Specification:
The protein is an alpha/beta fold. The chain contains 10 helices and 11 strands. Strand 1, helix 1 and strand 2 form a beta-alpha-beta unit. The radius of gyration is 19 Å and the shape is globular. The structure holds orotic acid and chloride ion. It comes from Maridesulfovibrio salexigens (strain ATCC 14822 / DSM 2638 / NCIMB 8403 / VKM B-1763).
Length: 311
Amino acid sequence: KYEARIGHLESPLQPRHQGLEKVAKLVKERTNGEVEFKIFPSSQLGNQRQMNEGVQFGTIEGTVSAAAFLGGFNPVVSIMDIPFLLPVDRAKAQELRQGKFGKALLKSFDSRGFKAIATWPNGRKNFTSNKPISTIADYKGQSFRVMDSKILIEQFAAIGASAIALPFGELYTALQNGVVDGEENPLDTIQRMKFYEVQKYLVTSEHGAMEDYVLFNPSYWESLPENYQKIIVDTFIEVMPGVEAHKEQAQKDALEVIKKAGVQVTPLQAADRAAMRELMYPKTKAAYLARAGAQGQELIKLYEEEYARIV
Ligand SMILES: O=C(O)c1cc(=O)[nH]c(=O)[nH]1
Ligand SMILES: [Cl-]
């Protein structure tokens, strides 16, 4: 009775998709079989811009998108692209993500033609390249692919590197053919997309967050009885802790595979981490405010207040 086609970019093997399958099963049972989610991975329904427009228009009922692709439709959510924003402690990050701060980000979608019903962690990003990236000076003049975010372009600019937005489904080929030197992603994404076949170097950095937003077409959402709306939200929240543990463990598994495949892996040096943060924050925050305006200032303030309380 209430079928929803929900698309996303990732391999079906990864924790987001597995979690969405679990959500689908539980929602179908808890709604007397009436709400049926069908999940389409791997850009099957389009690249993320196409899926986002599809959800807004209602050609598809939903998408799970990284925040990094949503700043055109919703500049406010791009705060989540700022490097080194989240605490290292995952539980404290969750207090931010699931508390007043994250709630304000979900609410910001209402006026923009999406119903954002939940946000899930979905890993932290690491640098890869075909040129050495062992020191901060090494990044100068290199080019990196980013997700479709002006904030992420500024991230790389802050350390003298260039960045261009390329669709995820084209990324393997882009790396293979030297369209860019490098990219950034969680280790298990690097593994499942086989970016180790086309990148020689990896820096374990966790310098920025990959943040998932669960978006429904508003008319679809509104067509659902209230009790089903509540069941869906609660089910996403119920499945979340298992998804995060699967995602954390997948990074460990992925690192072993990446090292075995012959990628040179180094940790981000502490002084390089601090220097990156100090250079990247002003530029990425200014970019965020430039596009989000006063509402972005409001979210920065709310983040600072909640971070101080929590951390
Ligand atoms: O475009 C990407 O890099 C990307 C998208 C996505 O949904 N998940 C991910 O890990 N990376
Ligand atoms: Cl894409």
